[PDB]
Amino acid sequence: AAAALAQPVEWTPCRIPGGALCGKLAVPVDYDRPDGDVAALALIRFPATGDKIGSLVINPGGPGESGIEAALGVFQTLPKRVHERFDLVGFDPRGVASSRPAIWCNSDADNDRLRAEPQVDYSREGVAHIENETKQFVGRCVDKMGKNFLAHVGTVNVAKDLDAIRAALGDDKLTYLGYSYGTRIGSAYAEEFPQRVRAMILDGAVDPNADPIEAELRQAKGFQDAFNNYAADCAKNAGCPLGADPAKAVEVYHSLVDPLVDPDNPRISRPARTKDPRGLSYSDAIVGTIMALYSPNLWQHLTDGLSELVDNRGDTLLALADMYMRRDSHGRYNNSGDARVAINCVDQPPVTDRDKVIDEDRRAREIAPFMSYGKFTGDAPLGTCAFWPVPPTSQPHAVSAPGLVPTVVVSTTHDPATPYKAGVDLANQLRGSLLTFDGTQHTVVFQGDSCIDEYVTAYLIGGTTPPSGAKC
């Protein structure tokens, strides 16, 4: 519906708090082919209540996460001063959620069937099974999307979309807040449109120069550290289902989740009983645990989920895994999972070397024993991107944007998903400021911490950056 060239966004009330307005923006699928296929990006806008500086455009990360949904969430925790001075704007990146066309690969049944599998058998036969499933997944993506849209969903094109959004909002310069993956949008935008950046907050950092395997292993270490902090906390509390000795927590954890796999056939699930018909598979138990380690706000749920497992029940861990997968109460998945893969697979060269992948699994098992089953087998499956039918549109490199205004990178000391040091490195590459938050969670801005939010508010409004060494 949105007209292919700079037709202004037609705003209409969303059908929802704060007089929110909604509209669509047309962008070209291929920027080298502006008369070609068009994508329609969905936008949400919460008008400022005071003297408007401009729009605060956010991205929640993922990739594959809806910026409209995140804006609705952020609206509730937005500081009064930011609400006064900025229109809060969310957008769904190309291919995500309400934007069109939307990346779709799996049916709801495809996803359910995969989650029912233990996903633990890394024998040659098990690796072949996983890689066959992966090839069929990629075939489904190609069949539903076509190679042309898949080729162009990457962050390099999201950054160009973002400048079109800036201009469509009437802003001369971009004020931007990005979480996790959204800091790759931020630094890509910073490199291509440095003269358009008014202000940037980047919470939970992606280092675009990282080696993909070492970044994955650092992420594995981040989740093991988070697991360790969760379990040492749990050990102080009565009835801790992992026990009172945190040196034994990984062992006790495996005594609870390992029985969900048939000990004589690793392909056979023995799911824990739930009220849901699915029951709790081993793979969903791990995924639900990973979900809970995103925030101490979810640690009570992990404790509930593990206490249930003592009695061979799995309802809370299943619900946590559903939250991770974004499967709603009617069994419908949103498209975040499929979009996340399709975007990740074009944002850098995939790992295709079998030895590197096998060595990565050998190391991951030692770095993060909570989420590995049994023993190293000598084999491991290639990731989905090794089979991707469309080439990368970005290459790892250190951010180089010399004219860029000072920016703020927020980094949490025991962030499991984007570890602390990645924020230090990103702030170094941007020559920006590093704001430290001491905690065991992924992201922190506009999530209840006045110390963080006061720094962010002063930067968004006055351009003031935190002093060197600032901590919250």
XYZ file of C-alpha atoms in Angstrom:
472
model
C 0.000 0.000 0.000
C 2.808 2.430 0.846
C 3.799 4.224 -2.361
C 7.192 3.147 -3.628
C 8.949 6.529 -3.560
C 9.026 9.176 -0.821
C 5.281 9.357 -0.318
C 4.876 10.745 3.214
C 3.901 8.294 5.921
C 0.131 8.416 6.333
C -0.320 8.256 10.109
C -3.477 6.814 11.684
C -4.287 5.862 15.300
C -3.128 2.340 16.156
C -5.764 -0.316 16.836
C -2.958 1.264 22.966
C -1.659 4.118 25.113
C -0.439 7.664 24.616
C -2.268 8.608 21.413
C -0.072 6.216 19.440
C 0.013 6.625 15.662
C 0.822 3.911 13.128
C 1.833 3.957 9.482
C 3.929 2.333 6.788
C 7.004 3.414 4.826
C 7.943 2.004 1.427
C 11.620 1.186 0.843
C 13.181 -0.602 -2.161
C 14.019 -4.261 -1.624
C 17.253 -3.709 -3.602
C 18.664 -0.188 -3.311
C 20.537 -0.751 -6.607
C 17.101 -1.469 -8.161
C 14.857 1.377 -6.939
C 12.204 0.638 -9.595
C 11.985 -2.981 -8.415
C 10.109 -4.805 -5.695
C 9.152 -2.733 -2.655
C 9.013 -3.585 1.040
C 6.583 -1.896 3.435
C 7.999 -1.107 6.894
C 5.579 -0.832 9.815
C 6.067 2.133 12.185
C 4.655 3.238 15.534
C 4.887 6.774 16.904
C 4.175 8.068 20.429
C 4.116 11.894 20.114
C 6.178 13.975 22.539
C 4.207 15.673 25.318
C 6.379 18.828 25.474
C 8.855 20.766 23.337
C 9.745 18.265 20.603
C 13.439 17.858 19.797
C 12.722 15.050 17.341
C 12.081 11.310 17.302
C 13.804 8.724 19.478
C 13.990 5.687 17.156
C 14.567 2.345 18.886
C 15.495 -1.193 17.849
C 15.179 -4.031 20.396
C 17.677 -6.467 18.908
C 17.335 -10.125 17.989
C 17.541 -9.874 15.070
C 13.931 -10.703 14.222
C 12.415 -8.741 17.142
C 9.548 -6.309 16.516
C 10.391 -2.655 17.114
C 6.691 -1.801 17.337
C 6.235 -4.305 20.179
C 9.371 -3.011 21.897
C 8.243 0.624 21.584
C 4.965 -0.323 23.293
C 7.021 -1.917 26.073
C 9.492 0.972 26.319
C 6.654 3.512 26.439
C 5.702 2.194 29.900
C 9.226 2.686 31.354
C 10.243 5.830 29.440
C 11.505 8.653 31.699
C 9.157 11.645 31.867
C 11.781 13.966 30.339
C 12.344 11.714 27.306
C 8.577 11.442 26.797
C 8.391 15.261 26.897
C 11.189 15.964 24.418
C 10.935 13.070 21.900
C 8.423 11.170 19.805
C 9.083 7.534 20.728
C 9.258 5.635 17.420
C 9.521 1.895 16.841
C 9.845 0.160 13.484
C 9.766 -3.420 12.319
C 12.919 -3.996 10.199
C 12.470 -5.315 6.681
C 11.182 -8.893 6.884
C 10.210 -8.707 10.577
C 6.794 -8.972 12.272
C 4.315 -6.499 10.721
C 6.610 -5.391 7.882
C 5.945 -6.864 4.429
C 7.023 -9.162 3.016
C 7.697 -11.035 6.282
C 10.376 -13.733 6.439
C 8.666 -17.103 6.889
C 10.343 -20.504 6.676
C 8.754 -22.900 9.176
C 5.131 -23.682 9.828
C 4.051 -23.896 13.468
C 4.245 -27.689 13.090
C 7.810 -27.577 11.751
C 8.873 -25.681 14.889
C 6.947 -27.921 17.311
C 8.409 -31.052 15.715
C 11.977 -29.747 16.080
C 11.463 -28.789 19.738
C 10.223 -32.314 20.524
C 13.675 -33.702 19.649
C 16.391 -33.929 22.324
C 18.854 -32.415 19.757
C 21.631 -34.108 21.714
C 22.896 -36.905 19.404
C 26.156 -35.714 17.814
C 27.211 -39.083 16.443
C 27.696 -39.147 12.671
C 24.097 -40.331 12.329
C 22.861 -37.517 14.585
C 24.882 -34.872 12.755
C 23.505 -36.115 9.410
C 19.948 -35.901 10.790
C 20.425 -32.316 12.008
C 21.995 -31.198 8.735
C 19.200 -32.840 6.731
C 16.650 -30.915 8.819
C 18.697 -27.757 8.202
C 18.750 -28.254 4.417
C 14.975 -28.725 4.441
C 14.580 -25.527 6.495
C 16.627 -23.543 3.950
C 14.573 -25.013 1.105
C 11.416 -23.775 2.829
C 12.876 -20.255 3.213
C 13.762 -20.119 -0.492
C 10.355 -21.509 -1.504
C 8.364 -18.980 0.547
C 10.577 -15.872 0.165
C 12.588 -16.135 -3.046
C 16.339 -15.538 -3.170
C 16.040 -11.826 -3.974
C 14.285 -10.813 -0.758
C 16.518 -13.117 1.295
C 19.614 -11.614 -0.318
C 18.659 -8.117 0.888
C 17.336 -8.523 4.464
C 20.723 -7.841 6.031
C 21.742 -5.050 8.367
C 23.538 -3.103 5.610
C 20.099 -2.541 4.074
C 18.354 -1.992 7.420
C 20.766 0.916 7.984
C 19.703 2.474 4.681
C 16.061 1.898 5.643
C 16.826 3.699 8.900
C 17.929 6.847 7.082
C 14.722 6.773 5.037
C 12.838 6.486 8.343
C 14.764 9.471 9.732
C 13.744 11.582 6.719
C 10.141 10.320 6.798
C 9.871 11.390 10.441
C 10.948 14.952 9.560
C 14.220 14.650 11.507
C 17.341 16.302 10.066
C 19.467 14.003 12.251
C 18.881 10.621 13.868
C 18.470 10.058 17.605
C 18.785 6.311 18.108
C 18.649 3.685 20.860
C 19.662 0.138 19.929
C 19.696 -3.010 22.041
C 22.019 -5.982 21.327
C 21.755 -6.749 17.637
C 20.442 -3.181 17.282
C 23.936 -1.896 18.005
C 24.979 -3.506 14.702
C 22.231 -1.454 13.059
C 23.639 1.520 14.960
C 27.278 1.128 13.941
C 26.319 0.288 10.333
C 24.199 3.457 10.227
C 27.068 5.372 11.844
C 29.461 4.247 9.092
C 27.195 5.023 6.146
C 25.477 8.221 7.426
C 27.859 9.716 10.031
C 26.744 13.253 9.117
C 23.150 12.305 10.063
C 23.795 11.032 13.606
C 22.559 13.375 16.345
C 22.806 10.873 19.212
C 23.215 7.137 19.798
C 22.710 4.842 22.795
C 23.909 1.262 22.188
C 22.939 -1.108 25.029
C 24.330 -4.650 24.867
C 27.039 -4.530 22.259
C 27.878 -6.432 19.091
C 31.513 -6.078 17.996
C 31.409 -6.119 14.159
C 35.090 -7.143 14.065
C 34.615 -10.323 16.111
C 35.452 -13.759 14.832
C 32.070 -15.573 14.747
C 33.316 -18.690 16.562
C 35.128 -16.819 19.315
C 32.101 -14.555 19.788
C 29.851 -17.635 20.087
C 32.183 -19.188 22.672
C 32.323 -15.911 24.587
C 28.519 -16.030 24.556
C 28.617 -19.628 25.811
C 30.877 -18.447 28.650
C 28.501 -15.568 29.346
C 25.567 -17.936 29.853
C 27.653 -20.279 32.021
C 28.703 -17.289 34.160
C 25.030 -16.287 34.393
C 24.084 -19.859 35.273
C 26.763 -19.774 37.977
C 25.425 -16.510 39.429
C 21.847 -17.820 39.339
C 22.880 -21.020 41.115
C 25.025 -19.335 43.776
C 22.062 -17.075 44.496
C 19.726 -20.082 44.563
C 22.062 -21.905 46.985
C 21.421 -19.224 49.637
C 17.662 -19.807 49.421
C 15.627 -22.529 51.105
C 14.703 -25.499 48.929
C 17.084 -24.624 46.095
C 16.430 -27.376 43.518
C 20.114 -27.261 42.520
C 21.236 -27.781 46.136
C 23.121 -25.658 48.638
C 26.609 -26.264 47.190
C 27.043 -24.178 44.006
C 30.177 -26.126 43.018
C 27.768 -29.050 42.388
C 24.984 -27.046 40.692
C 25.874 -28.039 37.107
C 25.921 -31.708 38.175
C 22.565 -31.496 39.966
C 21.111 -29.563 37.012
C 22.092 -32.409 34.692
C 20.593 -34.931 37.132
C 17.289 -33.100 36.481
C 17.398 -32.526 32.715
C 19.404 -35.541 31.503
C 16.597 -38.051 32.337
C 14.540 -36.258 29.656
C 16.750 -38.173 27.155
C 16.628 -41.960 26.817
C 20.049 -43.005 28.216
C 20.383 -45.821 25.630
C 19.147 -43.931 22.550
C 19.965 -40.196 22.485
C 17.357 -39.665 19.755
C 14.486 -40.695 22.084
C 12.746 -38.065 24.186
C 11.343 -38.908 27.637
C 9.513 -35.610 28.146
C 8.589 -34.403 31.592
C 4.848 -34.303 32.219
C 3.056 -31.006 31.585
C -0.571 -29.921 31.401
C 0.271 -28.966 27.818
C 0.177 -32.052 25.517
C 3.795 -31.514 24.407
C 5.522 -32.237 27.692
C 9.048 -30.905 28.241
C 11.851 -32.132 25.971
C 15.540 -31.860 26.877
C 16.076 -29.196 24.216
C 13.148 -27.115 25.526
C 14.498 -27.473 29.078
C 17.853 -26.032 27.963
C 16.171 -23.267 25.942
C 13.916 -22.411 28.879
C 16.981 -22.195 31.128
C 18.718 -19.914 28.634
C 15.610 -17.702 28.524
C 15.599 -17.329 32.305
C 19.278 -16.299 32.355
C 18.506 -13.116 30.392
C 17.381 -11.351 33.590
C 17.341 -11.920 37.378
C 13.628 -11.092 37.026
C 13.270 -14.611 35.569
C 15.400 -16.506 38.115
C 12.368 -17.336 40.294
C 10.781 -18.962 37.228
C 13.923 -21.026 36.593
C 13.817 -22.172 40.218
C 10.114 -23.064 39.843
C 10.942 -24.900 36.620
C 13.717 -26.943 38.197
C 11.664 -27.727 41.318
C 8.978 -29.059 38.981
C 11.627 -31.270 37.342
C 12.471 -32.861 40.702
C 8.907 -34.247 40.497
C 9.208 -35.026 36.754
C 7.032 -32.055 35.762
C 7.982 -29.451 33.173
C 5.312 -26.743 32.889
C 7.366 -23.668 33.857
C 10.434 -24.573 31.780
C 8.093 -25.231 28.836
C 6.518 -21.790 29.236
C 9.978 -20.206 29.427
C 10.968 -21.982 26.209
C 7.726 -20.771 24.581
C 8.627 -17.252 25.623
C 12.044 -17.650 24.002
C 10.489 -19.082 20.795
C 7.551 -16.621 20.882
C 4.966 -19.401 20.636
C 1.642 -18.043 21.900
C -1.100 -19.872 23.838
C -2.738 -21.026 20.582
C 0.479 -22.646 19.346
C 1.204 -19.892 16.814
C 4.785 -18.689 16.391
C 5.588 -15.175 15.370
C 8.261 -14.895 12.671
C 11.136 -13.785 14.940
C 12.900 -17.170 14.789
C 12.839 -17.409 10.997
C 13.795 -13.748 10.527
C 16.622 -14.056 13.071
C 18.286 -16.830 11.057
C 17.768 -15.176 7.662
C 19.251 -11.874 8.864
C 22.143 -13.451 10.771
C 23.105 -15.561 7.761
C 23.706 -12.538 5.499
C 25.369 -10.254 8.064
C 28.756 -12.060 7.914
C 30.507 -15.002 6.177
C 29.200 -18.268 7.624
C 31.452 -20.852 9.223
C 31.728 -23.773 6.778
C 34.884 -25.587 7.963
C 33.999 -28.909 9.639
C 37.121 -28.976 11.833
C 36.426 -25.494 13.188
C 32.851 -26.478 14.071
C 33.966 -29.727 15.741
C 36.640 -27.846 17.690
C 34.055 -25.223 18.690
C 31.841 -27.942 20.178
C 34.818 -29.466 22.009
C 35.542 -26.105 23.639
C 31.900 -25.150 24.265
C 31.376 -28.365 26.228
C 34.175 -27.308 28.605
C 33.227 -23.619 28.730
C 29.466 -24.129 29.290
C 28.864 -27.622 30.704
C 25.302 -26.695 31.836
C 24.112 -26.804 28.230
C 25.970 -29.795 26.799
C 24.879 -33.421 27.119
C 27.092 -36.479 27.470
C 30.613 -36.489 26.059
C 32.378 -34.933 23.101
C 31.766 -37.260 20.135
C 34.366 -35.986 17.642
C 31.595 -34.678 15.375
C 29.243 -31.694 15.440
C 26.749 -30.218 12.963
C 27.363 -27.212 10.777
C 25.112 -24.243 11.526
C 22.193 -23.167 9.346
C 24.179 -20.388 7.679
C 26.677 -22.855 6.210
C 23.866 -23.918 3.852
C 22.531 -20.417 3.148
C 21.748 -19.916 -0.572
C 22.547 -16.202 -0.671
C 25.890 -14.493 0.097
C 26.817 -12.195 2.997
C 26.279 -8.472 2.532
C 28.613 -7.470 5.390
C 32.160 -8.490 6.330
C 33.699 -8.311 9.821
C 35.731 -5.152 10.367
C 36.361 -2.599 13.086
C 33.906 0.290 13.073
C 35.493 3.248 11.274
C 33.414 6.436 11.516
C 35.859 9.251 12.299
C 33.505 12.157 12.089
C 30.862 10.591 14.340
C 29.422 12.580 17.242
C 30.210 11.118 20.702
C 27.970 8.114 21.436
C 27.227 6.052 24.566
C 27.728 2.277 24.726
C 26.013 0.670 27.736
C 27.590 -2.615 28.806
C 26.588 -4.933 31.652
C 29.401 -6.632 33.563
C 27.910 -10.153 33.428
C 25.625 -9.802 30.407
C 25.221 -13.384 29.050
C 24.104 -12.557 25.506
C 26.409 -9.606 24.668
C 29.251 -9.800 27.214
C 30.783 -6.780 28.918
C 34.048 -6.709 26.967
C 32.214 -6.546 23.630
C 30.852 -3.194 24.835
C 34.337 -2.014 25.773
C 35.563 -2.949 22.292
C 32.625 -1.334 20.499
C 33.031 1.912 22.473
C 36.744 1.896 21.562
C 35.963 1.508 17.856
C 33.372 4.293 17.992
C 35.644 6.517 20.136
C 32.535 6.864 22.286
C 31.750 6.627 25.971
C 31.373 3.394 27.938
C 28.683 3.327 30.635
C 29.019 0.291 32.891
C 26.154 -1.504 34.637
C 27.059 -4.100 37.273
C 24.570 -6.948 36.842
C 23.780 -10.372 35.385
C 21.321 -9.501 32.625
C 21.157 -8.581 28.955
C 20.521 -4.801 28.469
C 19.436 -2.272 31.105
C 18.373 1.034 29.528
C 14.792 2.155 30.303
C 14.276 -0.922 32.493
C 13.944 0.485 35.998
C 17.438 1.768 36.899
C 17.436 5.506 37.571
C 21.245 5.731 37.526
C 21.391 4.337 33.975
C 18.322 6.294 32.837
C 19.571 9.621 34.246
C 22.803 9.270 32.261
C 20.835 8.353 29.146
C 18.320 11.198 29.526
C 21.050 13.809 29.963
C 22.794 12.481 26.828
C 19.662 12.336 24.676
C 18.585 15.872 25.602
C 21.772 17.811 26.284
C 24.419 15.755 24.512
C 26.223 15.165 27.813
C 28.241 11.976 27.922
C 28.977 10.009 31.105
C 32.440 10.559 32.574
C 35.138 7.992 31.933
C 34.631 5.094 34.348
C 30.939 5.863 34.970
C 29.227 2.888 36.674
C 25.687 2.053 37.786
